[PDB]
Design an enzyme around this catalytic site. Structure first.
Site, mmCIF file in Angstrom:
data_model
loop_
_atom_site.group_PDB
_atom_site.id
_atom_site.type_symbol
_atom_site.label_atom_id
_atom_site.label_comp_id
_atom_site.label_asym_id
_atom_site.label_seq_id
_atom_site.Cartn_x
_atom_site.Cartn_y
_atom_site.Cartn_z
ATOM 1 N N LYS A 125 0.877 -1.162 0.000
ATOM 2 C CA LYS A 125 0.000 0.000 0.000
ATOM 3 C C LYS A 125 0.914 1.212 0.000
ATOM 4 O O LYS A 125 1.708 1.387 0.933
ATOM 5 C CB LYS A 125 -0.866 0.024 1.264
ATOM 6 C CG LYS A 125 -1.908 1.165 1.271
ATOM 7 C CD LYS A 125 -2.821 1.071 2.502
ATOM 8 C CE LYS A 125 -2.129 1.546 3.789
ATOM 9 N NZ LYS A 125 -1.854 3.005 3.767
ATOM 10 N N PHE A 146 -4.961 6.834 -1.282
ATOM 11 C CA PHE A 146 -5.096 8.266 -1.464
ATOM 12 C C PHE A 146 -6.315 8.888 -0.757
ATOM 13 O O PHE A 146 -6.529 10.093 -0.867
ATOM 14 C CB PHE A 146 -5.104 8.568 -2.969
ATOM 15 C CG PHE A 146 -3.768 8.339 -3.662
ATOM 16 C CD1 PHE A 146 -3.663 8.521 -5.035
ATOM 17 C CD2 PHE A 146 -2.616 7.993 -2.949
ATOM 18 C CE1 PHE A 146 -2.443 8.367 -5.700
ATOM 19 C CE2 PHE A 146 -1.377 7.836 -3.609
ATOM 20 C CZ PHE A 146 -1.297 8.026 -4.993
ATOM 21 N N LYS A 147 -7.095 8.073 -0.042
ATOM 22 C CA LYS A 147 -8.257 8.552 0.733
ATOM 23 C C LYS A 147 -9.012 9.589 -0.073
ATOM 24 O O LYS A 147 -9.323 10.662 0.441
ATOM 25 C CB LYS A 147 -7.779 9.233 2.025
ATOM 26 C CG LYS A 147 -6.875 8.406 2.898
ATOM 27 C CD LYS A 147 -7.655 7.333 3.580
ATOM 28 C CE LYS A 147 -6.938 6.864 4.834
ATOM 29 N NZ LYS A 147 -5.616 6.253 4.498
ATOM 30 N N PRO A 158 -17.305 14.760 -7.276
ATOM 31 C CA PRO A 158 -17.189 13.775 -8.357
ATOM 32 C C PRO A 158 -16.197 14.093 -9.471
ATOM 33 O O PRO A 158 -15.377 13.244 -9.845
ATOM 34 C CB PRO A 158 -18.624 13.664 -8.873
ATOM 35 C CG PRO A 158 -19.431 13.835 -7.602
ATOM 36 C CD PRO A 158 -18.713 15.007 -6.921
ATOM 37 N N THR A 188 -13.554 15.989 -9.563
ATOM 38 C CA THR A 188 -12.165 15.933 -9.156
ATOM 39 C C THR A 188 -11.747 14.498 -8.841
ATOM 40 O O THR A 188 -10.633 14.090 -9.176
ATOM 41 C CB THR A 188 -11.946 16.841 -7.947
ATOM 42 O OG1 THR A 188 -12.234 18.187 -8.346
ATOM 43 C CG2 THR A 188 -10.512 16.752 -7.459
ATOM 44 N N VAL A 190 -3.033 -2.210 12.765
ATOM 45 C CA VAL A 190 -2.401 -3.362 13.408
ATOM 46 C C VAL A 190 -0.992 -3.005 13.866
ATOM 47 O O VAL A 190 -0.192 -2.473 13.098
ATOM 48 C CB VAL A 190 -2.312 -4.561 12.432
ATOM 49 C CG1 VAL A 190 -1.580 -5.743 13.086
ATOM 50 C CG2 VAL A 190 -3.708 -4.978 12.014
ATOM 51 N N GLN A 214 -0.873 1.163 16.085
ATOM 52 C CA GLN A 214 -2.087 1.791 16.588
ATOM 53 C C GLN A 214 -2.807 0.958 17.630
ATOM 54 O O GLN A 214 -3.804 1.402 18.189
ATOM 55 C CB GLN A 214 -3.039 2.141 15.432
ATOM 56 C CG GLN A 214 -2.453 3.157 14.467
ATOM 57 C CD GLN A 214 -3.380 3.464 13.303
ATOM 58 O OE1 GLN A 214 -4.480 3.978 13.500
ATOM 59 N NE2 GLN A 214 -2.935 3.148 12.083
ATOM 60 N N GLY A 215 -2.312 -0.251 17.885
ATOM 61 C CA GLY A 215 -2.927 -1.079 18.918
ATOM 62 C C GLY A 215 -3.666 -2.341 18.487
ATOM 63 O O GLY A 215 -3.939 -3.221 19.316
ATOM 64 N N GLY A 216 -3.997 -2.437 17.205
ATOM 65 C CA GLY A 216 -4.707 -3.602 16.704
ATOM 66 C C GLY A 216 -3.910 -4.893 16.754
ATOM 67 O O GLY A 216 -2.683 -4.878 16.656
HETATM 68 O O1 LIG Z 1 -8.462 4.008 9.181
HETATM 69 C C1 LIG Z 1 -7.376 4.002 8.659
HETATM 70 C C2 LIG Z 1 -7.101 4.085 7.259
HETATM 71 N N1 LIG Z 1 -5.861 4.060 6.822
HETATM 72 N N2 LIG Z 1 -4.752 3.955 7.669
HETATM 73 C C3 LIG Z 1 -3.413 3.919 7.077
HETATM 74 O O2 LIG Z 1 -2.845 2.641 7.156
HETATM 75 C C4 LIG Z 1 -1.464 2.712 7.519
HETATM 76 C C5 LIG Z 1 -1.321 2.143 8.901
HETATM 77 O O3 LIG Z 1 0.038 2.321 9.274
HETATM 78 P P1 LIG Z 1 0.643 1.871 10.687
HETATM 79 O O4 LIG Z 1 0.675 0.252 10.639
HETATM 80 O O5 LIG Z 1 2.044 2.345 10.676
HETATM 81 O O6 LIG Z 1 -0.057 2.437 11.884
HETATM 82 C C6 LIG Z 1 -1.044 4.141 7.261
HETATM 83 O O7 LIG Z 1 -0.591 4.351 5.904
HETATM 84 C C7 LIG Z 1 -2.349 4.906 7.531
HETATM 85 O O8 LIG Z 1 -2.435 6.164 6.852
HETATM 86 C C8 LIG Z 1 -4.923 3.870 9.054
HETATM 87 O O9 LIG Z 1 -3.966 3.777 9.785
HETATM 88 N N3 LIG Z 1 -6.231 3.900 9.476
HETATM 89 O O1 LIG Z 2 -16.720 21.455 -1.304
HETATM 90 C C1 LIG Z 2 -15.837 21.577 -2.122
HETATM 91 C C2 LIG Z 2 -14.431 21.609 -1.860
HETATM 92 N N1 LIG Z 2 -13.571 21.757 -2.843
HETATM 93 N N2 LIG Z 2 -13.952 21.887 -4.180
HETATM 94 C C3 LIG Z 2 -12.913 22.065 -5.201
HETATM 95 O O2 LIG Z 2 -12.896 23.368 -5.692
HETATM 96 C C4 LIG Z 2 -12.716 23.389 -7.103
HETATM 97 C C5 LIG Z 2 -13.993 23.905 -7.719
HETATM 98 O O3 LIG Z 2 -13.852 23.813 -9.126
HETATM 99 P P1 LIG Z 2 -14.983 24.233 -10.177
HETATM 100 O O4 LIG Z 2 -15.048 25.826 -10.113
HETATM 101 O O5 LIG Z 2 -14.436 23.870 -11.488
HETATM 102 O O6 LIG Z 2 -16.278 23.531 -9.969
HETATM 103 C C6 LIG Z 2 -12.202 22.015 -7.474
HETATM 104 O O7 LIG Z 2 -10.762 21.922 -7.409
HETATM 105 C C7 LIG Z 2 -12.855 21.140 -6.401
HETATM 106 O O8 LIG Z 2 -12.144 19.930 -6.131
HETATM 107 C C8 LIG Z 2 -15.308 21.864 -4.541
HETATM 108 O O9 LIG Z 2 -15.631 21.980 -5.700
HETATM 109 N N3 LIG Z 2 -16.181 21.710 -3.486
#
Ligand SMILES: O=c1cnn([C@@H]2O[C@H](COP(=O)(O)O)[C@@H](O)[C@H]2O)c(=O)[nH]1
Ligand SMILES: O=c1cnn([C@@H]2O[C@H](COP(=O)(O)O)[C@@H](O)[C@H]2O)c(=O)[nH]1
Lengths: 211, 212
Positions: free
Chosen positions: B32, B61-62, B67, B69, B172, B175-177
């Protein structure tokens, strides 16, 4: 912000992004750069823009991870030259605090995103928005992002954060938001497509400012 | 996934990331990669890892934008070679749908993040988690992410998504898991720091595998 207008530069190729930004530079001095451009052209694009256009850069990265990861993302972003970073508040206070701590360390700013402008925001974000804004106030956040598409929600957000806080708002133009109505509550509006997809971006920016 | 273990490679410099990943490759075949590494070394690191280690790459990338973007972010990510992308469900169904549409167009997968593992997740995410999971089921999502730190929530999530869905779980170790308890519900566990900050990452990975 110059003319209270921030350009959302979401084109994905460097040449087009540079062209449009240069064409509208006389109307706006603050550019919001997000993942579409950064993941396509690299983080070095932030410093390139800052230098070439002498504009402030807001990194719209919608940071939304755990505290430890948020810190790393913020550090990499400020190292790249961003003046501010946009962070989601939905993941909680500890995640937001991690971003604030890095901004403090690096002399930068955090913008807290409270409610989003798109339709889907009504499902989960809207119901948590007021509380997210209050959390921001409690953490000392002074910069916020709220939706142009729902001025009644923008009004409520402005009420929670006070007149001293700085509020910027996307959703103007393409998503349906109105420049004038939005500026009744926000300090600045963010505009992307209405300007960058226009046949004449400079004329589009000029028109918005005229309005 | 090999040994039901996914490495969260969050080191921020290419040389260290390459060293650790190569050291534990005999134990894990899925890595990941998130923004800490990509924003420090560039998107090209995804294709490099895929080739060098012959592993599947999940881009953590969370994704959490509107939509329009989200579509751009997903397209750039799959162009870079990622096999899957992790997307937040809290911004709503249209945002998730946009990611699914690009994954369909590019022959890739979307993992829906339902509840997070850190303390702050209790403030807003937890209360929306069940609904986010049901939204995923309704949209046809087949891959999910849930918290190792709250196995009772992981159980509830597994309950909503069914046994046929694929569920991976971070939190895991650091973080404690717990690996074993988490695998009672998840198909695979994600481990970052417990492995990459260890004095001997291979030994740490091997120990985790032996504990399960
Ligand atoms: O709910 C979530 C979602 N994603 N991650 C991600 O998973 C990894 C966990 O890493 P760690 O084993 O070092 O704590 C990191 O990249 C972190 O951003 C979490 O920890 N919790
Ligand atoms: O609630 C939010 C937060 N951020 N943006 C961002 O602001 C820009 C708005 O673009 P637009 O004028 O082309 O719709 C884009 O980068 C978009 O990801 C939204 O549109 N809405």
């Amino acid at each position: 912000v110059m003319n209270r207008l921030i350009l959302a530069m979401d084109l994905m190729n460097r040449d087009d992004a540079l062209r449009v930004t240069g064409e509208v530079r006389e109307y706006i001095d603050t550019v919001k750069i997000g993942y579409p451009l950064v993941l396509s052209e690299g983080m070095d694009i932030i410093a390139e823009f800052r230098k070439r256009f002498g504009c402030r850069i807001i990194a719209d990265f919608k940071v939304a991870d755990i505290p430890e990861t948020n810190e790393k993302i913020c550090r990499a972003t400020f190292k790249a030259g961003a003046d501010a970073i946009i962070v989601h508040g939905f993941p909680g206070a500890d995640s937001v605090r991690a971003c604030l701590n890095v901004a403090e360390e690096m002399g930068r700013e955090v913008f807290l995103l409270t409610e989003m402008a798109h339709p889907g925001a009504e499902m989960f974000i809207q119901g948590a928005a007021d509380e997210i804004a209050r959390m921001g106030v409690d953490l000392g956040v002074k910069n916020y992002v709220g939706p142009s598409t729902r001025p009644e929600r923008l009004s409520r957000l402005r009420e929670i954060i006070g007149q001293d806080s700085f509020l910027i708002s996307p959703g103007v133009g393409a998503q349906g938001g109105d420049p004038g109505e939005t500026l009744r509550f926000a300090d600045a509006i963010i505009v992307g497509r209405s300007i960058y997809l226009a046949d004449n971006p400079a004329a589009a920016a000029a028109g918005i400012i005229e309005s």
